[PDB]
Amino acid sequence: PRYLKGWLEDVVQLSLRRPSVRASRQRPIISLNERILEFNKRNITAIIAVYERKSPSGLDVERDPIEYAKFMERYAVGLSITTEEKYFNGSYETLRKIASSVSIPILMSDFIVKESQIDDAYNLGADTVLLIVKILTERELESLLEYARSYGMEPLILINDENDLDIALRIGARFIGIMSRDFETGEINKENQRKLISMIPSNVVKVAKLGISERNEIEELRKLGVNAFLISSSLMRNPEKIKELIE
Ligand SMILES: *C(C)CC(=O)c1ccc2cc(OC)ccc2c1
Known part of the structure; x- marks a missing residue:
């Protein structure tokens, strides 16, 4: 990994020691990026609803994961399950249960x-994984992209600035997430997000x-060419908001 500071260095060290699982997935991969493109054709706003109890951004809640997932199945293009344990209160079992409870990617x-x-992601039923440019060397990111693709996953490669974008495009990322919160400052920076898009x-x-x-904001961003929206806190706090966001 890169040499980082603070909580990000800590979560990398923790991830290096994450024990792997033994499990068999129950269905083939369903391509998340392809379903997004399907929703775009039909002018249905494509929201990837996040399940996570906690975040360093200030979210800290409890909510049943299966009840949340089954509600979101009706509306969302896909679900994202945050499996990081220490800072996000996630778990591999949470992913397993959700992926086994709904039909969407x-x-x-x-x-x-x-x-x-x-x-672990593949064996627990996920259809793709997040890769984060900032935490990896370019060689590491390239290698992990290739490894995900060897399972039939197209990873979502997450960028925070132009430097990250330079790397992502060079290695041929086809599915890019653009952060709104800055790793360096801890602050929301919507203008930078629109520039990068x-x-x-x-x-x-x-x-x-x-x-x-x-x-x-969803409508404006869609106008600018955004294909989908990966939304966490506001849906974890009020799930029914997704309906208003897509209608
Ligand atoms: C996405 C899974 C997480 C994300 O974009 C995020 C969460 C929390 C956080 C905190 C920061 O400083 C405290 C900076 C960036 C950041 C980004």
């Missing part, structure tokens, strides 16, 4: 630094990552 959301974490070629499926959001 599943993103595993964690700090992936080794191949066995991709094995405008730098991504049309052949890449683009996902805007958001905690709080509102329908107005």
Whole structure:
């Protein structure tokens, strides 16, 4: 991994030692990026609803994962399950249960630094994984992209700035997430997110990552070429908001 500071360095070290699972998935991969493109054709706003109890951004709640997932199955293009334990209060069992409770595609959301974490995602039923440019060297990111693809996954490669984008495009990312919160400052920076979106070629499926959001903002971003929205806090706090965000 990169040499990092603070909580991000800590979560990387923890991830390096994450024990792997032994499990068999129950169905083939369903492509998340392809379903997004289907929703786009039909002008159905494509929201990837996040299940996570906690975040360093300030979310800290309890909610039954299966009840949340079954509600979201009706509306969301896919679900993202944050499996990082220490900072996000996630778990592999949470992913397993959700992926086994609904029919729509599943993103595993964690700090992936080794191949066995991709094995874990696949074996627990996820359809794809998040890879984060900032935490990996370019060589590591390239290798993990290839490894995900060897399972039939197209990972969601998460960028925070132009430097991250340069790397992601060079290695041929086809599914890019654009953060709204800055790793360096801890602050929401919506202007930077829109700039980055405008730098991504049309052949890449683009996902805007958001905690709080509102329908107005979704419409504007869609206008700018965003294909889908990865939304956490506001849906964890009020699940029914997704209906207003897509209608
Ligand atoms: C996405 C799974 C997480 C995300 O974008 C995020 C969460 C929390 C957080 C905290 C920061 O400083 C405390 C910076 C960035 C950041 C990003």
